Amino acid sequence: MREIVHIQAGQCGNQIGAKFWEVISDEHGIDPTGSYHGDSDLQLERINVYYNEAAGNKYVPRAILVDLEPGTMDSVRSGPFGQIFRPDNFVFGQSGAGNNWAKGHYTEGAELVDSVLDVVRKESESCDCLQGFQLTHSLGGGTGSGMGTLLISKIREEYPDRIMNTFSVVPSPKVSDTVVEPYNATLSVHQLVENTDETYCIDNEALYDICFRTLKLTTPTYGDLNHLVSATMSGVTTCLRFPGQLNADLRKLAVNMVPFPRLHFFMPGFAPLTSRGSQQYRALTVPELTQQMFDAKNMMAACDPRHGRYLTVAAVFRGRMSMKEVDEQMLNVQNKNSSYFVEWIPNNVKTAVCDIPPRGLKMSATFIGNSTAIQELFKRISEQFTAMFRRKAFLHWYTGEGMDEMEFTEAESNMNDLVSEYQQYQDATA
Amino acid sequence: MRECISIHVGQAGVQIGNACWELYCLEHGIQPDGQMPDDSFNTFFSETGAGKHVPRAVFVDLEPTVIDEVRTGTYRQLFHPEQLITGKEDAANNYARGHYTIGKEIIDLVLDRIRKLADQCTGLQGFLVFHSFGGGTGSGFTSLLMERLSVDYGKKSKLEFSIYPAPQVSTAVVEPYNSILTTHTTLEHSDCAFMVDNEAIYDICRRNLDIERPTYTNLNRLISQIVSSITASLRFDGALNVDLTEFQTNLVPYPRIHFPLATYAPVISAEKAYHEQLSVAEITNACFEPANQMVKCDPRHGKYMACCLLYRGDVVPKDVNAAIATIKTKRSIQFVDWCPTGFKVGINYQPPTVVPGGDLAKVQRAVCMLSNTTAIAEAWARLDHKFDLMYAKRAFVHWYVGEGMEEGEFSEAREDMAALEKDYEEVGVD
Ligand SMILES: Nc1nc2c(ncn2[C@@H]2O[C@H](COP(=O)(O)OP(=O)(O)OP(=O)(O)O)[C@@H](O)[C@H]2O)c(=O)[nH]1
Numbered sequence: 124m125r126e127i128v129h130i131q132a133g134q135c136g137n138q139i140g141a142k143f144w145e146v147i148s149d150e151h152g153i154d155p156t157g158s159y160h161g162d163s164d165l166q167l168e169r170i171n172v173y174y175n176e177a178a179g180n181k182y183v184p185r186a187i188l189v190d191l192e193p194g195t196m197d198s199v200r201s202g203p204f205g206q207i208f209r210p211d212n213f214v215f216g217q218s219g220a221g222n223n224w225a226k227g228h229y230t231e232g233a234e235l236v237d238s239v240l241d242v243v244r245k246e247s248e249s250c251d252c253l254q255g256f257q258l259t260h261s262l263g264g265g266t267g268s269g270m271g272t273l274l275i276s277k278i279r280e281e282y283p284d285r286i287m288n289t290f291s292v293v294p295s296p297k298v299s300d301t302v303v304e305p306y307n308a309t310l311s312v313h314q315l316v317e318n319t320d321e322t323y324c325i326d327n328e329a330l331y332d333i334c335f336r337t338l339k340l341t342t343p344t345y346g347d348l349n350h351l352v353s354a355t356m357s358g359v360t361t362c363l364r365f366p367g368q369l370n371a372d373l374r375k376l377a378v379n380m381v382p383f384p385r386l387h388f389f390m391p392g393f394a395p396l397t398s399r400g401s402q403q404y405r406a407l408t409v410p411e412l413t414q415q416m417f418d419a420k421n422m423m424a425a426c427d428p429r430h431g432r433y434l435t436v437a438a439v440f441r442g443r444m445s446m447k448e449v450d451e452q453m454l455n456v457q458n459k460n461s462s463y464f465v466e467w468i469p470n471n472v473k474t475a476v477c478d479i480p481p482r483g484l485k486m487s488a489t490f491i492g493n494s495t496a497i498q499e500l501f502k503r504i505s506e507q508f509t510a511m512f513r514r515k516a517f518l519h520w521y522t523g524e525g526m527d528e529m530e531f532t533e534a535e536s537n538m539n540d541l542v543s544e545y546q547q548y549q550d551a552t553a
Numbered sequence: 554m555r556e557c558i559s560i561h562v563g564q565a566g567v568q569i570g571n572a573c574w575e576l577y578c579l580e581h582g583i584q585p586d587g588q589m590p591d592d593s594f595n596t597f598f599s600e601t602g603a604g605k606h607v608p609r610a611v612f613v614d615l616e617p618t619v620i621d622e623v624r625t626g627t628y629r630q631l632f633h634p635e636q637l638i639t640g641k642e643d644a645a646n647n648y649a650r651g652h653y654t655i656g657k658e659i660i661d662l663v664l665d666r667i668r669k670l671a672d673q674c675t676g677l678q679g680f681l682v683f684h685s686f687g688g689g690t691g692s693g694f695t696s697l698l699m700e701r702l703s704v705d706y707g708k709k710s711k712l713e714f715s716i717y718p719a720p721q722v723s724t725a726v727v728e729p730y731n732s733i734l735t736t737h738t739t740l741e742h743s744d745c746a747f748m749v750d751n752e753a754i755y756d757i758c759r760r761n762l763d764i765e766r767p768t769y770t771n772l773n774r775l776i777s778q779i780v781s782s783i784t785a786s787l788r789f790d791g792a793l794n795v796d797l798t799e800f801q802t803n804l805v806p807y808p809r810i811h812f813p814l815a816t817y818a819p820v821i822s823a824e825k826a827y828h829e830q831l832s833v834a835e836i837t838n839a840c841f842e843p844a845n846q847m848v849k850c851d852p853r854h855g856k857y858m859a860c861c862l863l864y865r866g867d868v869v870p871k872d873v874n875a876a877i878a879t880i881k882t883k884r885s886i887q888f889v890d891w892c893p894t895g896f897k898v899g900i901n902y903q904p905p906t907v908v909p910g911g912d913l914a915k916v917q918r919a920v921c922m923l924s925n926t927t928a929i930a931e932a933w934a935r936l937d938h939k940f941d942l943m944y945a946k947r948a949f950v951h952w953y954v955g956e957g958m959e960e961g962e963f964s965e966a967r968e969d970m971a972a973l974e975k976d977y978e979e980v981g982v983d
């Protein structure tokens with residue numbers, strides 16, 4: 124249970140995974156060549172969770188690269204710390220669908236998924252104590268979402284005894300490369316709501332809004348959002364990358380945070396607010412960080428957390444603070460806003476503390492929770508799909524292959540049932 | 554000849570086992586190599602022809618991490634590697650995985666080592682085992698192991714040192730489910746069991762120990778002190794002695810009610826050792842103090858059965874009788890007509906011992922009073938409230954359903970624990 128297999132999907136997934144690797148390597152004291160050079164023994168204590176011992180004393184990420192457009196792998200190689208990745212992990216299609224799920228699912232998806240199954244087996248049966256897989260994937264583009272769905276489905280059916288995890292880049296209406304987003308999102312969720320067991324949705328329009336207003340990034344590009352989402356995801360996986368009794372492995376995380384088979388959708392939260400290059404941030408008191416988790420703009424999903432009741436709560440703080448003050452603050456906020464939780468789930472607020480703070484920071488706050496606030500993403504995609512399908516707009520693009528809309532009806536019915544489950548769990552009394 | 558066997562499961566359970574074995578070897582003055590600088594040590598330690606002494610116990614867990622640090626700790630020349638068994642998969646706070654999905658795949662080898670170490674247990678009296686209710690491994694594998702040995706031998710004793718989890722230290726919200734499953738599946742087999750409510754030890758460390766914030770090391774050290782005080786009668790000989798069989802006779806009148814609520818006193822910090830220690834009467838009064846037990850119960854609403862005491866220090870029988878007479882005048886003691894007798898006396902002259910460098914200071918008198926009453930039903934009521942508030946909505950059940958289990962076992966365990974608690978209150982009813 125000492126190792127995790129990383130998987131990438133789509134371009135945006137590729138750069139978010141690369142940024143994840145470089146930030147965690149920076150905080151784990153790993154040089155570009157893969158040899159440890161830090162001082163704290165905690166980084167090397169369980170580096171096997173996201174790294175593998177290599178030739179000499181080198182440490183190599185246990186990731187894999189999956190896409191179809193040839194430019195994604197080249198961009199990954201261009202970025203810093205690209206070379207430290209496994210050289211043979213680059214699995215890319217020779218044509219590239221380009222946000223066109225219909226062509227990339229069958230014409231290029233078959234051999235690609237066979238090859239990725241071959242490699243995942245290559246480092247699975249060779250692996251010692253494999254536990255599960257986690258993914259950084261996108262949903263706005265049909266191609267990357269298609270690969271993500273294919274890989275998760277095959278690795279779930281091949282490994283039913285292994286924990287399933289994935290991170291989703293939820294499409295946003297502010298920026299839309301293609302308008303086929305509703306179809307891809309519906310098929311992806313129809314696959315994952317039972318295929319996956321962990322889902323930290325990252326909503327793009329929330330990132331754009333926080334960059335524009337809170338972070339003053341008037342022009343949020345790919346890297347601008349990628350820096351902050353990588354910081355947040357390093358914060359959330361700090362539970363795993365370093366020793367801690369709370370959330371020892373992915374399976375413990377799943378059993379503690381998933382109350383129902385379809386309740387595996389999470390609100391990401393991180394504090395304090397930070398950007399790329401801004402060093403003007405100073406030391407902040409703990410109570411500010413504690414109250415910061417009630418802020419919508421400090422979340423990574425454009426929801427209304429006040430409306431929902433947190434079924435489960437996960438939080439970690441990084442730094443050297445007197446954490447008795449921390450759980451005093453958590454008790455105070457729980458007493459203040461118990462109306463924002465569910466009384467029938469005893470003590471869903473599980474929190475631990477991490478000694479090492481993230482890069483360019485001395486105290487940090489990370490928030491993870493499960494509530495009905497995620498249901499507004501499903502409501503948004505439902506109304507978008509209804510608007511796009513009432514006139515059957517762009518349906519002929521999908522039907523060019525020849526499939527019917529029966530599976531579309533199944534997907535929409537299943538997600539409406541999911542929304543109903545969320546609403547009934549919110550309305551449930553004690 | 555009077556051999557005894559101990560078992561350790563779960564990270565918390567095996568850690569407490571390590572701590573208690575450390576305090577045991579300090580009690581006998583056993584160096585980490587096993588050098589010998591009462592004869593009851595042979596009941597827990599096995600001596601070879603070369604003079605090396607190894608405890609007649611075993612540390613097992615589905616994860617190796619704690620066993621790894623044990624095998625890299627400070628007792629390399631003490632424990633043989635074959636009584637330190639590590640699994641590959643993890644129960645992950647799940648009774649189902651720890652019992653059936655992963656438990657049965659290793660318990661056969663576990664029984665292989667148990668049988669080989671029992672091959673030289675001629676005078677075997679019974680088995681000891683440490684587990685926490687919250688611990689998924691310490692729940693499922695504990696229940697499986699207990700029922701397996703009940704099948705193997707039966708009348709051979711199997712006494713429990715359980716750890717009752719607390720919300721401040723709790724890691725998994727599913728923990729009351731595990732507690733209910735353990736108590737239902739072990740009630741027919743646990744001849745006697747001791748709980749350790751971590752809220753009690755938490756407040757003891759906060760106030761009595763004068764510690765700003767309780768740590769796992771300190772609370773586990775004090776728990777090991779309590780365990781050693783309980784097991785001293787087995788590990789030492791005095792004028793008044795109590796053994797496992799007569800532990801069962803004098804502590805378990807009702808087969809279903811096999812939860813004797815013990816207590817220990819006194820505790821004082823190193824910095825406060827400069828003050829005169831409490832006398833026999835003072836410590837005896839401090840015994841029944843509401844915040845001076847291993848659980849956060851309400852002794853003011855209890856129906857006592859019979860007193861059992863464990864003096865291990867400089868207590869003369871005259872002081873024992875004086876303390877008993879003074880306690881007999883207490884206004885918070887209510888007895889039962891079916892057990893007119895209400896006192897049992899055990900005195901040990903061996904001075905108490907504590908871990909060097911710990912928070913607790915050296916004392917010359919100590920008391921481990923043994924009690925059983927309806928006051929223990931408050932923790933039962935708390936876990937009942939948790940289980941009813943969760944299982945009504947069937948929260949977290951799907952994780953158990955995915956391991957070849959149904960809701961019927963949950964329901965029947967619920968009514969079994971309801972029958973237990975109604976038995977408690979009915980015995981409490983005049
Ligand atoms: N008394 C005591 N309890 C602890 C300690 N550490 C953790 N616990 C509690 O014990 C529970 C888990 O018990 P364990 O036996 O260690 O876990 P396990 O049986 O190995 O099961 P898994 O955690 O799923 O592997 C946690 O929820 C904690 O609340 C400790 O040091 N002392």
Ligand SMILES: Nc1nc2c(ncn2[C@@H]2O[C@H](COP(=O)(O)OP(=O)(O)O)[C@@H](O)[C@H]2O)c(=O)[nH]1
Nearest residue numbers: 133134135263264266267298299300327345348
């Ligand atoms: N936050 C974030 N979103 C991105 C990034 N790159 C693309 N996106 C979103 O993804 C959508 C396009 O999907 P795309 O990445 O092209 O799919 P793919 O080509 O199959 O991998 C757009 O609507 C963008 O909003 C990025 O670097 N960061």
